[PDB]
Symmetry: C4
Subunit: 255 residues, 4 copies
Amino acid sequence: SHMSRKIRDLIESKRFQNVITAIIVLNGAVLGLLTDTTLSASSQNLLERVDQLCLTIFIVEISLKIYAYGVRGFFRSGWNLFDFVIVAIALMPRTFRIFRVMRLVSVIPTMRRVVQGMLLALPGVGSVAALLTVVFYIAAVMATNLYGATFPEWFGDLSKSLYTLFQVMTLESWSMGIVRPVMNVHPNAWVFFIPFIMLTTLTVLNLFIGIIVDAMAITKEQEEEAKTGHHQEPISQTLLHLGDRLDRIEKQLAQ
Amino acid sequence: SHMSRKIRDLIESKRFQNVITAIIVLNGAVLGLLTDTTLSASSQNLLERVDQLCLTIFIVEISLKIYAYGVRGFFRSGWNLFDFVIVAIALMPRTFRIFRVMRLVSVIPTMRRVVQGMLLALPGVGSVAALLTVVFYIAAVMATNLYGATFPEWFGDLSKSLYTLFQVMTLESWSMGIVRPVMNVHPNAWVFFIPFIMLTTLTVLNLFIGIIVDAMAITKEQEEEAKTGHHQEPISQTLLHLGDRLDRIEKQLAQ
Amino acid sequence: SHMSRKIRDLIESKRFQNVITAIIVLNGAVLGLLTDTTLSASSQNLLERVDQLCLTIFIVEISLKIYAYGVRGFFRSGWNLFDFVIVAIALMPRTFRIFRVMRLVSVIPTMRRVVQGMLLALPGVGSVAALLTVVFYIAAVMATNLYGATFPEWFGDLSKSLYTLFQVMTLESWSMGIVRPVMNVHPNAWVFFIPFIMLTTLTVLNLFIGIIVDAMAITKEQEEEAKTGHHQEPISQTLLHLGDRLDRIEKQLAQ
Amino acid sequence: SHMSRKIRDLIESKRFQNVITAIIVLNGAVLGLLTDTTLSASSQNLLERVDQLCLTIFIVEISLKIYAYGVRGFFRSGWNLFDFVIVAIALMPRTFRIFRVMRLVSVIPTMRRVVQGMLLALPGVGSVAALLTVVFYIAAVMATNLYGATFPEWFGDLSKSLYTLFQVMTLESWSMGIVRPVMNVHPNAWVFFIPFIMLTTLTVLNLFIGIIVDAMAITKEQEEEAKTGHHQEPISQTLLHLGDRLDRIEKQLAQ
Ligand SMILES: CCCCCCCCCC(=O)N(CCO)C[C@@H](O)[C@@H](O)[C@@H](O)[C@@H](O)CO
Ligand SMILES: CCCCCCCCCC(=O)N(CCO)C[C@@H](O)[C@@H](O)[C@@H](O)[C@@H](O)CO
Ligand SMILES: CCCCCCCCCC(=O)N(CCO)C[C@@H](O)[C@@H](O)[C@@H](O)[C@@H](O)CO
Ligand SMILES: CCCCCCCCCC(=O)N(CCO)C[C@@H](O)[C@@H](O)[C@@H](O)[C@@H](O)CO
Ligand SMILES: Nc1nc2ccc(OC(F)(F)F)cc2s1
Ligand SMILES: Nc1nc2ccc(OC(F)(F)F)cc2s1
Ligand SMILES: Nc1nc2ccc(OC(F)(F)F)cc2s1
Ligand SMILES: Nc1nc2ccc(OC(F)(F)F)cc2s1
Ligand SMILES: [Cl-]
Ligand SMILES: [Cl-]
Ligand SMILES: [Cl-]
Ligand SMILES: [Cl-]
Ligand SMILES: [Cl-]
Ligand SMILES: [Cl-]
Ligand SMILES: [Cl-]
Ligand SMILES: [Cl-]
Ligand code: NA
Ligand code: NA
Ligand code: NA
């Protein structure tokens, strides 16, 4: 009965998605080729047109979408917003056009759900992250005061110290490159660095594991709802309802 | 009543498996000795005959098998196919004969099941892997543009950048060897590299954990079915059936 | 009806907490600025007053608290004790004032619960930690005896050996920096170092995983009790009570 | 009524255990002091007597034990056997006496149970370990053939290659120290090394996680049985028995 309705049906098809995916990939491949500094002037010119085309197909797509759903209903979705900004900002002649390839995530549903699970897991680890942040800040202040005068390249100011401490937490050359040189001047520096490592590696892995365990559960419920309209009821609710059926046959057997 | 049937019984015995295992090991040991560049001409000649023998015993084995199961029923199995190719390609006088030792996996059932679990887990992490791939590709394009002119050995082209970024994701000399040298020329490069590390280490570990958790469950169900013909019913189905027995005694107590 | 009661209500408000949080942050920011060695004499003087103020607001706070709860009831809490010491020791004109910023943990409840979970998990991994400790001590004695005379910088005495072995367990330059140089003199040293690595990396990760899995469960029960006054009953107790309702309807249907 | 019985009661007391623990620690402390190469002749002499004493107290202990339980019942226990060998071999005037300190594990029950869980978990990961072993062996043969002539220090023979590949699997200097130098001569060597890393890091972590998850469950059941004489019934058996109580009230309500 309606134009709008027939467009939404197009937008939401599997073929349309495949086509926009193919254009993202192509845009991506062309921006990759353009890294090649040896290119002829005409080749670069060509590739830049392919990019122009890709960007155009993107504006038609988003247009189609803002029409078929209306200004307020398109902007209802973070993903549409994201798609919109990514495409919009390219219409302002920043220099990292290649971020356009993140649209593979916004356009492919299973990929969107991976990202959604990870974003959704961030709140629940916020206290673990804050504890890490506090540990970092305190360590960076002490390292600057302790070591900044004698090791200024690594600890000369707070910024330097944070950088160095991040390197130390990743275990990268922590000993041969940082702590042994420091200990030649400050023999007890292991008393600072080895507890720092123990605590940050424990906390970071806590942070990581919390994100991953949650993100995987969220994603998995999203995949279920996407396929069947509902998710698995948690065992605890299943046992709750079993508790109810038991109450209703205990009460029924009064007489 | 049948030749075929008596051969299949041989093939499927525990003694036959032990014998083929022993020949794989021996083939493997001889290819190891042949790495020894100091060997006398006669020793090498000997070892090469032992390999020839090993390969022959393999053709008889596979023959036995294609006969006792017929062309279409042998080629029904990925493992038979794999065994077939590995042995076949050696009959074309590639240079990595040592891959023959992967037959330890195809011939030993518990080992086959480990590999089966890992292959079977690959689909379920395909979106996590694709997200990693996207992150890599985008990072490699930006690193080439940002750093290729000033650091061409590490970022001079897309290939270089991908390699370097893989090294960076593994945390290997990421700071003393790559990022500190880069920052002497581009002082804000930590703004690129430290988020890259955070995101890829999170995603890779997500990838790893997903594979392992699934592969372990799959393998474990395979080990159960191999031993008893069935696996453990998931708790959720057990609770489902408990829900059914409750319905049938709630309905029965109508009167 | 009471002063005490109206103060406790202030102390326990959300606004009061926000205010003490803001003062910790500010104290923290000022101690950070003071790392900056380039500061004018007047700037340093200013910042030191801001610290003096911050410390004062802290004494009023703790005073308020010891009054509104009484000496014995304030000192009932580890966190109050901790808050008390941190603030008290600053009234003794040690040099790491920046530890004051750990009060973000004692004053923010969700952060307190993260730390509480980790402390509470320590007992249950105490045997895994002791095993690691034993492995370290034995390794450090043997490394000193084996390698101390020929590699005294790394193994010259027990202290040196422990340090080196910690570095080796973290995998930092273990081979190019320590074990290959050692093997040029003692060709079988891989027989010591590679088992050391296998065993300590297995044990440390066991230690880490045990802490994290437990700390996460404890923290999560604390967050529940903080919000609703109780936690989730473990599935095992739920099944226990289900077993009871079954007994009471099996016994009831005697006649 | 019996000597034997009163000795076993002594052996099995908490005070006796504390005393043997204290002697292990002391033996351990003295062997540590003896690493100190600067010691006076008389100090070393003293410490060596303390060791002699410690070893003597150990023989009385084991004697007490072989008597109070009899030759066949003492040798029934792996831990007694282990205690016996450790003490016995010292009566043969090998040079790593410090292994005596592993008796802290055999004498302290919670520590014994950690080790027991890890030993008991080894069978269930045997296939994952064998797969790793196969991957290593094949990689080491190919690396020797590919790279041995041009990089003999790292790949000159099978032993060298295994060592290098272990280093590579731990990610230690894998790129700046091994693979970049190799690629200057063999530009496609990343095609060998990067898949090697992906596969071995996945497999090793699978190995590690399998050991730890199992060892923790085993240990935890052992701690339960040690305290209460039984362990927790697995949920699956609890649900089985719930299924039985349901059958017995479905069958009972026939009439
Ligand atoms: C977890 C958070 C880790 C964040 C680290 C912050 C980096 C500091 C940013 C900064 O402002 N810098 C100063 C210039 O803008 C660069 C520093 O990173 C510093 O390391 C350099 O000065 C080195 O090149 C000197 O050795
Ligand atoms: C996660 C995917 C990581 C994949 C990495 C791809 C490697 C690039 C393959 C390639 O085509 N190369 C060019 C020649 O074929 C070799 C490069 O690896 C490159 O690093 C070398 O040019 C260095 O030797 C220079 O410093
Ligand atoms: C898991 C526990 C790891 C703990 C490590 C203890 C460190 C030893 C403390 C000590 O007393 N030292 C001697 C001076 O006080 C410093 C040593 O750390 C040592 O490494 C130095 O002498 C090096 O600078 C020489 O190469
Ligand atoms: C996962 C299993 C990793 C096991 C590694 C086996 C080590 C090899 C033992 C051996 O027999 N060697 C030869 C002498 O006995 C020593 C080698 O380790 C070798 O690396 C040395 O020759 C280097 O010093 C040369 O660069
Ligand atoms: N693979 C490995 N990673 C680590 C990280 C830390 C560690 O010790 C510490 F105390 F830091 F946790 C040992 C190891 S082994
Ligand atoms: N053993 C350890 N591995 C890592 C890996 C990453 C890390 O920080 C990051 F933000 F990258 F995750 C810290 C650590 S400690
Ligand atoms: N990322 C990785 N960390 C490790 C730690 C240890 C290891 O081998 C060992 F035997 F030590 F466990 C391999 C790896 S891969
Ligand atoms: N902390 C980290 N350890 C690893 C180990 C391997 C890895 O990539 C690979 F493909 F090897 F798994 C990335 C990372 S990040
Ligand atoms: Cl770009
Ligand atoms: Cl010092
Ligand atoms: Cl070969
Ligand atoms: Cl810059
Ligand atoms: Cl300070
Ligand atoms: Cl040696
Ligand atoms: Cl010793
Ligand atoms: Cl090559
Ligand atoms: Na590492
Ligand atoms: Na490293
Ligand atoms: Na390194």
